[PDB]
Amino acid sequence: RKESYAIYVYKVLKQVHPDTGISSKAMSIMNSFVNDVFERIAGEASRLAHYNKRSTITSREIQTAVRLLLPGELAKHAVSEGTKAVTKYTSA
Amino acid sequence: NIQGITKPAIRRLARRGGVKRISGLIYEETRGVLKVFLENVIRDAVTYTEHAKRKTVTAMDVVYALKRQGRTLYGFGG
Amino acid sequence: VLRDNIQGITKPAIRRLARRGGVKRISGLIYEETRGVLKVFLENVIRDAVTYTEHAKRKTVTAMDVVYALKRQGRTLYGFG
Amino acid sequence: TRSSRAGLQFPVGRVHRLLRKGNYAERVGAGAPVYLAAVLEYLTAEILELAGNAARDNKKTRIIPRHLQLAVRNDEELNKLLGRVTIAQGGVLPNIQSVLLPK
Amino acid sequence: RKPPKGMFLSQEDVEAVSANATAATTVLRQLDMELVSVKRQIQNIKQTNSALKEKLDGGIEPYRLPEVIQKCNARWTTEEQLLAVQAIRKYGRDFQAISDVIGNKSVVQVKNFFVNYRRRFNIDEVLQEWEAE
Secondary structure, three states: OOOOOHHHHHHHHHHHOOOOEEOHHHHHHHHHHHHHHHHHHHHHHHHHHHHOOOOEEOHHHHHHHHHHHOOOHHHHHHHHHHHHHHHHHHHO | OHHHOOOHHHHHHHHHHOOOOOOOOHHHHHHHHHHHHHHHHHHHHHHHHHHHOOOOOOHHHHHHHHHHOOOEEEOOOO | OOOOOOOOOOOOHHHHHHHHHOOOOOOOOHHHHHHHHHHHHHHHHHHHHHHHHHHHOOOOOOHHHHHHHHHHOOOOOOOOO | OHHHHOOOOOOHHHHHHHHHOOOOOOEEOOHHHHHHHHHHHHHHHHHHHHHHHHHHHOOOOEEOHHHHHHHHHHOHHHHHHOOOEEEOOOOOOOOOOOOOOOO | OOOOOOOOOOHHHHHHHOOOOOHHHHHHHHHHHHHHHHHHHHHHHHHHHHHHHHHOOOOOHHHOOOOOOOOOOOOOOHHHHHHHHHHHHHHOOOHHHHHHHHOOOOHHHHHHHHHHOHHHHOHHHHHHHHOOO
């Protein structure tokens, strides 16, 4: 069994464009993009832990990592969407 | 082998790049650049296959060699 | 007491930087364009540097914060850590 | 499921699993997987939005790699994010220099 | 077939003159009436221009000011800089106007003043406020 974020790319696609589809090649391209951004953020946060003599990757490591990798507006909106989701998770 | 990419193929690659007029020596110079580029990528690709103890270079090895060569590619794996 | 000063000078410095680079003849508009490139370059490097100070919860930007910011910008520098 | 508790679509559990099984730190925070998945879900929504628009322009329903290439390269920030990335079967933007145009 | 030098000959004029027995007389009278109309229209406009020229008697000689011939200085004082700010506020990018307002600063020094003091004096904000009027 090979894992992927495929079924969730479909869900997000239908939430934004319900009358559109995706090909197998474009889906694998989306899979590599998700994993690439995954490794970049997780890698930068790992460095942040080592630089500050820390052994855990908390919310602050992810937040400043997204500040570093994304250029301004995408970083602004990513921090907003994430802190919104974390606050909603913290509630329940 | 190396002459298998000539005449219209080097012309078609120029059109997608936006080139209008092509000099005669471009074709030979293009092959040399492509040769060096392929030598570098395949070298790092073969190196992973050597460490993995395999006689078959997988699509990952090509992708991972391109990633190390600063040529990240989407489509042929995770 | 008259004052009235400005920042971002570097008028002869752009001439000295050209000589170490090997430039012989310098046009008049090079200096203004050179200043613009230095602004964008500093903006990128200082941005990543300030971000580390924000994460480290400090009001002082250390030389190290600059080093990894240059490291993140593909501008590895030896001598300061 | 922790993904439903955050209103997100991407699996917070799988993100938390991959963060532990990748050797980045001794410990992994509880809010980090929710916050990493939210950024990923936002970025996928950004691309899929511009890809669907490019699909409408080409009068096609299914998104092909041509749509992804056009979407990423028309955005100024998505181009900077994926500046060192080549998309398979993506192609290039139509661009002809002014001096090369006929006069 | 070729038309003569400086001579127009069309089929319409030939057909018009030979339209009837008194066609040539009618055309000549209509051209004469048009010429009289053009002649009196010249006379009326000539009378109008004569009256307008009578209004311009004297020129702008009593409204002339002497020239303030003064050399261009090299140092910027606080008064000179603030006067430049007000000149940018009203005139904008008219370097010759700003040079005349300050008086002792040439056009090239005003153009240099915009670049050297762009950040300190907020000239971009002053220009965008000038564009609003």
